[PDB]
């Protein structure tokens, strides 16, 4: 009980001391990234049928 | 006196809540209002892997994006080859029960773990023998929920005793032990950098554990039910988490808050697995309603639906290349959707 | 050539998987989900870390009995793993009607066992599976009831101090907890430290359960 | 007259083929349905499908035209196929009954002995017995007799009737219907006693479920085989139109069998899916 509460308060004190950025900045960063790496995504944009390994592609 | 400790803990919690609230001056939905929709994403069951004589409980791909492990209660761990759908290895497990698996990146090892509380590590590439029990890690006191490979040598595991561990295979010792969860750890997730890893729980909370230092960096709450799955964002700064409340939530590490919540009135069953596309624009969540939903990442607007199973969708996975999406259900059939 | 070798490997692995699946289906599973102090040790002995598994043969039949009593975790998360067992063995101690839990203050161990039984029987995963109910330490319970009454753990009971009456009362109290009265059946059995017939009763119960399953499959019953 | 029976025969053959092909597809598609008994069910469905494919059409055409218009070779072919298919259906029924009895009376021995390989072996044995009792004795002309009327019917291409001798008639009868009937009666009476005992342990459902299965088969086939075994002793006793009517009534068992042996919830779900 005593040790449990001591560890809890120590963890909370260590957690409260962290730099937090406004949600706007994180949202903008995630948006920019998801925008930049959209072309390479196979599922989002239709991948060429030939390049699609599972449908029809040369295996060896 | 416990009273003073409880009071200072409550004061610190209120301080943290006020700080977070002050940080959240806007909403991701508002910032993503101008963004257009992605469009309907049609997916067909290209390949179907059959052979498991019982329900499937877990699976995992490899860096090759070709091989994929699977787990079944029958007691056989299969290593399918997605391209040709021809079994390449079938390992008979000592324990009939298995609740997870793991395919190390290098591809020179495989893991397994279930109610037996014995994380087994089998070797795949050998000289003459097909498969042998390379090691058996038994330090936990409860059932294992998920295991991941930091590298060929180290392996991090989460157990039902509310304690995560970082075993070293060669030495077979708990190099580090993370504790602090108030409930069972039902799933974890490594980050691309592999330096930090997030861990869910059954007490409706997630913790961002630091591997090297071995301390909890941040804690995220907001769920009304247990967390049954979790997965980082491909960028590595945020992570999505399902739950039993039929609600997925995308938390951020830097801001330390919940960016957005995916939830619809129709869906009522809980989530059992989640994952992100390569670019992370589509969050694929395998619900317990015999279906799988591909939610938009930045607009929380559903897009398409995958329904090809009879029973609940147990495990879901995606390849690093992001070409295919494997889904394993209790129907005893894995489906490589594309 | 390599593709042919791979296909041959796949065929061999499939044949091995089918053979092993048949071998497994031949076996009969059982779940020994009991309380902490339900004399489960005596049962596991007279029959022969983590989950214990006892594989024993009788009358040319293989029984795999699983014991998860050493789990001590949230059962709601892994109970569904046992959906399909041929039955569920539930051990209860008739000598723990006047005792309480060392953790709780005024909760009878019998009441905790009753709650666990109600939880495991009315679960959405065991709607069809049957339940065998072993009652242990019958002589100790007889002596205890000879010394103390039964109104301790039940404030209402119409009956005098006697072994048979109390036995039947506990039996009915345990039986009246299942709601699917028309889908499953409870096979009760009183046992002692030296019974020498427990395996036989388990065999009879399993035979009856399998017969009823086949019947309901063929729609006869 | 013929216009009335044409639609009847057409509907009969269509129902037969539809039911049988549906059952076969249902058992072949889903994996849960791929069980032991479902193998015998598939054998029966395939036999009934062959019936509806080859036998029923020719018989309908014959009865509406009144004479055989194909040829003596095709007449013998059709007769042999009819005999094979009828015997295969009835023997699949009897082996299904034997399987049910073995399983319910002693579950462990049946679970241990029975296997997919042995099921295939038994199905092959049944079909081989059918072939041996249908093709060979027919091809060898041993079914024919010396009655001048029989020879007259044989030489004429039109007459494709089933006039036969005593030996082959009685033999085919006892091997295809009567022994299976006795086996089914005994095994089902035992199963009924077992179900009654079981219910006594723990009220007329089993009685009805068994009465359907048995009485359908009986009322479908017994008349034809009775008249058949009677025709041997003295021909003038029973007319011929009645014989053909009983033959068609027996064929109707081919349509009735699937609905009777594929009524469980699993089959219902598999059918609703497709
Ligand atoms: C009308 C003829 C061609 N059908 C014969 C009938 O189907 C039959 C089948 C099996 C027999 O053993 C039999 O005597 C008679």
């Amino acid at each position: 009980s005593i040790a449990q509460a001591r560890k809890l308060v120590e963890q909370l004190k260590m957690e409260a001391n962290i730099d937090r950025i406004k949600v706007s900045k994180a949202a903008a960063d995630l948006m920019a990234y998801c925008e930049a790496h959209a072309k390479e995504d196979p599922l989002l944009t239709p991948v060429p049928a030939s390049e699609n390994p599972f449908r029809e592609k040369k295996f060896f | 006196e416990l009273d003073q400790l409880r009071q200072e803990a409550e004061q610190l919690k209120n301080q943290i809540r006020d700080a977070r609230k002050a940080c959240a001056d806007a909403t991701l939905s508002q910032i993503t209002n101008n963004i257009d929709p992605v469009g309907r994403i049609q997916m067909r069951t290209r390949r179907t892997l059959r052979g498991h004589l019982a329900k499937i409980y877990a699976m995992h791909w490899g860096t090759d994006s070709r091989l994929l492990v699977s787990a079944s209660q029958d007691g056989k761990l299969i290593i399918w080859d997605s391209y040709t759908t021809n079994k390449v290895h079938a390992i008979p497990l000592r324990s009939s029960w298995v609740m997870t698996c793991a395919y190390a990146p290098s591809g020179n090892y495989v893991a397994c773990g279930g109610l037996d509380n014995i994380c087994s590590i089998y070797n795949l590439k050998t000289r003459e023998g097909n498969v042998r029990v390379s090691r058996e890690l038994a330090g936990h006191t409860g059932y294992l929920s998920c295991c991941r490979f930091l590298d060929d040598n180290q392996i991090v595991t989460s157990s039902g005793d509310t304690t995560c561990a970082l075993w070293d295979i060669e030495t077979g010792q708990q190099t580090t032990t993370f504790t602090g969860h108030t409930g069972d750890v039902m799933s974890l997730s490594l980050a691309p950098d592999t330096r930090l890893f997030v861990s869910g729980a059954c007490d409706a909370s997630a913790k961002l554990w630091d591997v090297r230092e071995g301390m909890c960096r941040q804690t995220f709450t907001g769920h009304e039910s247990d967390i049954n799955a979790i997965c980082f964002f491909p960028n590595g700064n945020a992570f999505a988490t399902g739950s039993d409340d039929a609600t997925c939530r995308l938390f951020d590490l830097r801001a330390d808050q919940e960016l957005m919540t995916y939830s619809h009135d129709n869906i009522i069953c809980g989530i059992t697995s989640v994952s992100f596309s390569k670019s992370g624009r589509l969050l694929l969540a395998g619900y317990d309603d015999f279906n799988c939903n591909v939610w938009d990442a930045l607009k929380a607007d559903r897009a398409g639906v995958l329904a090809g199973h009879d029973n609940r969708v147990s495990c879901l996975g995606v390849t690093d290349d992001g070409m295919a999406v494997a889904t394993g259900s209790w129907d005893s059939f894995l489906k490589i959707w594309n | 050539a390599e593709d042919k070798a791979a296909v041959e490997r796949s065929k061999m692995i499939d044949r091995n998987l089918r053979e092993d699946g048949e071998k497994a289906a031949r076996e009969v599973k059982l779940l020994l989900l009991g309380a902490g102090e339900s004399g489960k040790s005596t049962i596991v002995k007279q029959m022969k870390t983590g989950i214990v598994e006892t594989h024993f043969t009788f009358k040319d039949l293989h029984f795999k009995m699983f014991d998860v009593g050493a789990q001590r975790s949230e059962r709601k998360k892994w109970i569904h793993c046992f959906e399909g067992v041929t039955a569920i063995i539930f051990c209860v101690a008739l000598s723990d009607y006047d005792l309480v839990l060392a953790e709780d203050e005024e909760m009878n161990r019998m009441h905790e066992s009753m709650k666990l039984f109600d939880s495991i029987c009315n679960n959405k995963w065991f709607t069809d599976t049957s339940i065998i109910l072993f009652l242990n330490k019958k002589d100790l319970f007889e002596e205890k009831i000879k010394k103390s009454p039964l109104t301790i753990c039940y404030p209402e009971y119409a009956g005098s101090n006697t072994y048979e009456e109390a036995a039947a009362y506990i039996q009915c109290q345990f039986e009246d907890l299942n709601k699917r009265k028309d889908t499953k059946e409870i096979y009760t059995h009183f046992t002692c430290a030296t019974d020498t017939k427990n395996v036989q009763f388990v065999f009879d119960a399993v035979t009856d359960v399998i017969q009823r399953m086949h019947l309901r499959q063929y729609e006869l019953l | 007259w013929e216009a009335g029976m044409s639609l009847l025969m057409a509907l009969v053959v269509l129902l037969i083929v539809a039911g049988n092909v549906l059952v076969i597809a249902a058992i072949g598609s889903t994996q849960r349905l791929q069980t032991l008994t479902n193998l015998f069910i598939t054998s029966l469905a395939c036999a009934d499908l062959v019936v509806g494919l080859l036998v029923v059409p020719f018989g309908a055409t014959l009865v509406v035209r009144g004479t055989w218009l194909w040829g003596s070779f095709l007449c013998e072919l059709w007769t042999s196929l009819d005999v094979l298919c009828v015997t295969a259906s009835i023997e699949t029924l009897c082996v299904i009954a034997i399987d049910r009895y073995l399983a319910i009376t002693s579950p462990f021995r049946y679970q241990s002995l029975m296997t997919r390989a042995r099921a295939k072996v038994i199905i092959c044995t049944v079909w081989a017995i059918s072939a041996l009792v249908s093709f060979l004795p027919i091809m060898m002309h041993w079914w024919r007799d010396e009655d001048p009327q029989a020879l007259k019917c044989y030489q004429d291409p039109g007459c494709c009737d089933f006039v036969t001798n005593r030996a082959y008639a009685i033999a085919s009868s006892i091997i295809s219907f009567y022994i299976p009937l006795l086996i089914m009666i005994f095994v089902y009476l035992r199963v009924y006693r077992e179900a009654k005992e079981q219910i006594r342990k723990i009220e007329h459902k089993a009685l009805k479920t068994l009465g359907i299965i048995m009485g359908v088969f009986t009322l479908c086939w017994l008349p034809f085989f009775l008249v058949n075994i009677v025709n041997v002793f003295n021909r003038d006793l029973v007319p011929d139109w009645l014989f053909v009517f009983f033959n068609w009534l027996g064929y109707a068992n081919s349509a009735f069998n699937p609905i009777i042996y594929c009524r469980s919830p699993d089959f219902r779900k598999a059918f609703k899916r497709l």
Side-chain angles (χ1 to χ4, degrees), chain B residues 18-313:
Chain B
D18 263 348
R20 291 181 174 183
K21 186 141 164 92
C23 310
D25 189 21
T27 79
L28 173 53
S29 63
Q30 171 48 35
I31 309 311
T32 51
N33 177 27
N34 189 299
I35 315 297
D36 68 279
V38 67
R40 300 285 292 185
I41 300 312
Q42 289 74 348
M43 300 188 181
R44 312 278 181 269
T45 291
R46 300 309 211 283
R47 276 78 177 284
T48 293
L49 320 189
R50 54 166 53 79
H52 286 280
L53 305 154
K55 53 186 70 174
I56 284 167
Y57 277 5
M59 72 89 67
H60 200 269
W61 289 88
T63 57
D64 264 348
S65 297
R66 180 173 182 171
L67 305 155
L68 66 92
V69 183
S70 54
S72 166
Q73 269 210 328
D74 55 7
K76 298 273 186 169
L77 184 153
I78 305 289
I79 294 91
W80 286 89
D81 186 78
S82 89
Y83 286 158
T84 47
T85 80
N86 55 3
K87 305 179 184 60
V88 190
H89 281 83
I91 317 180
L93 302 170
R94 296 181 173 278
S95 177
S96 78
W97 325 103
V98 55
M99 291 201 71
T100 174
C101 275
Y103 207 53
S106 70
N108 298 326
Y109 287 94
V110 185
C112 163
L115 271 53
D116 52 2
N117 307 351
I118 292 167
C119 183
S120 305
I121 295 92
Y122 307 81
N123 185 324
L124 187 80
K125 279 192 167 59
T126 46
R127 306 177 198 81
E128 323 88 340
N130 46 327
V131 301
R132 279 255 281 272
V133 186
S134 176
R135 193 68 75 171
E136 298 187 354
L137 301 174
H140 289 293
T141 62
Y143 75 100
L144 275 72
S145 306
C146 183
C147 314
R148 294 278 177 269
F149 268 105
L150 281 163
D151 203 278
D152 55 10
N153 183 14
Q154 305 172 127
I155 191 183
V156 70
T157 63
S158 283
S159 89
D161 207 335
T162 82
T163 179
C164 304
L166 164 52
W167 295 85
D168 185 70
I169 290 167
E170 182 178 359
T171 312
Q173 293 175 343
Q174 286 186 335
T175 289
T176 308
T177 307
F178 320 87
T179 70
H181 279 285
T182 58
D184 310 330
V185 181
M186 277 296 295
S187 280
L188 71 93
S189 159
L190 278 286
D193 307 64
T194 77
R195 312 293 291 278
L196 319 170
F197 77 95
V198 294
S199 67
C202 274
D203 63 61
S205 70
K207 289 182 178 296
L208 174 72
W209 289 106
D210 195 333
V211 169
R212 278 159 173 74
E213 287 79 1
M215 62 184 179
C216 165
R217 288 226 161 190
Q218 306 189 62
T219 303
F220 310 83
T221 65
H223 276 290
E224 316 192 67
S225 316
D226 286 28
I227 289 164
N228 285 338
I230 170 161
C231 188
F232 269 103
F233 199 76
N235 182 16
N237 296 328
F239 64 95
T241 82
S243 65
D244 286 330
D245 199 2
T247 57
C248 302
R249 300 183 184 286
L250 174 60
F251 303 84
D252 178 292
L253 293 201
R254 293 133 71 183
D256 195 338
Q257 289 185 102
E258 160 179 358
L259 285 175
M260 190 154 63
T261 292
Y262 315 100
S263 182
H264 195 34
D265 304 75
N266 296 331
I267 59 188
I268 295 288
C269 305
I271 294 93
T272 319
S273 57
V274 308
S275 290
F276 266 94
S277 173
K278 207 197 178 196
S279 199
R281 185 63 178 281
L282 312 181
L283 162 52
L284 286 70
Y287 284 83
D288 187 69
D289 197 5
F290 311 158
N291 304 329
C292 165
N293 298 344
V294 187
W295 302 74
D296 190 335
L298 280 52
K299 304 205 79 184
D301 297 337
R302 171 153 55 173
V305 59
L306 273 58
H309 292 289
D310 183 278
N311 212 324
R312 61 161 74 181
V313 164

Side-chain angles (χ1 to χ4, degrees), chain D residues 125-150 152-196:
Chain D
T125 293
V126 159
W127 274 69
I129 292 166
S130 89
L132 171 149
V133 70
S134 66
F135 291 107
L136 278 295
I138 279 174
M139 282 173 59
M140 299 296 99
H141 312 297
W142 292 330
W143 70 285
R144 295 182 182 174
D145 68 69
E146 52 77 21
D147 184 358
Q149 192 277 337
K152 286 151 58 180
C153 174
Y154 302 148
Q155 300 313 131
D156 174 69
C159 191
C160 184
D161 292 330
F162 197 72
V163 178
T164 174
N165 62 25
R166 156 173 291 95
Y168 170 61
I170 288 171
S172 71
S173 299
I174 61 176
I175 297 177
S176 284
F177 176 87
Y178 287 109
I179 274 170
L181 181 65
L182 292 152
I183 287 167
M184 289 179 64
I185 288 167
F186 167 60
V187 303
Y188 276 114
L189 270 173
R190 178 65 198 285
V191 161
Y192 171 81
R193 195 171 64 82
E194 195 70 13
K196 183 178 179 181

Side-chain angles (χ1 to χ4, degrees), chain C residues 18-19 22 25-28 58-61 63 181-182 184-185 187 203-204 206-212 214-221, chain D residues 37 99-100 103-108 110-116 188 191 194-195 197-199 201-202 205-207 209-210 213 263-265:
Chain C
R18 288 206 312 279
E19 177 43 36
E22 203 283 347
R26 280 176 174 174
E27 261 173 8
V28 163
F58 192 86
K59 288 291 204 305
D60 216 326
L61 199 56
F63 295 160
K181 281 269 185 173
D182 58 64
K184 53 168 63 176
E185 186 66 5
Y187 302 100
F203 178 83
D204 289 338
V206 168
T207 66
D208 288 334
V209 165
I210 290 174
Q211 270 191 23
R212 290 182 185 189
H214 288 288
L215 287 174
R216 290 171 189 176
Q217 274 179 13
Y218 291 123
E219 311 179 358
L220 293 177
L221 184 44
Chain D
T37 61
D99 178 8
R100 270 170 187 181
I104 285 160
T105 193
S106 295
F108 310 135
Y110 162 68
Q111 259 188 334
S112 62
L113 301 170
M114 194 65 67
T115 184
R116 300 191 65 81
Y188 276 114
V191 161
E194 195 70 13
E197 182 185 290
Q198 208 68 50
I199 296 163
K201 292 289 188 177
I202 179 173
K205 181 164 174 54
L207 186 46
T209 315
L210 293 154
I213 296 160
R263 204 172 66 270
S264 297

Side-chain angles (χ1 to χ4, degrees), chain A residues 5 12-15 18 20-23 26 29-31 34 37-38 40-42 44 52 54-55, chain B residues 5 12-13 23 46-47 82 216 218-219 233 252 254 256-257 259 277-279 281 321-322 324 336 338:
Chain A
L12 276 170
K13 200 195 306 310
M14 194 277 291
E15 270 201 309
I18 57 183
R20 316 170 200 266
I21 65 176
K22 306 197 308 310
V23 170
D29 185 359
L30 283 166
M31 186 187 70
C34 196
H37 289 41
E40 64 196 289
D41 212 328
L44 182 142
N52 199 319
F54 291 72
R55 297 160 73 182
Chain B
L5 287 65
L12 262 180
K13 300 271 288 282
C23 310
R46 300 309 211 283
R47 276 78 177 284
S82 89
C216 165
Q218 306 189 62
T219 303
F233 199 76
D252 178 292
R254 293 133 71 183
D256 195 338
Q257 289 185 102
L259 285 175
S277 173
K278 207 197 178 196
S279 199
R281 185 63 178 281
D321 289 326
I336 316 308
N338 192 0

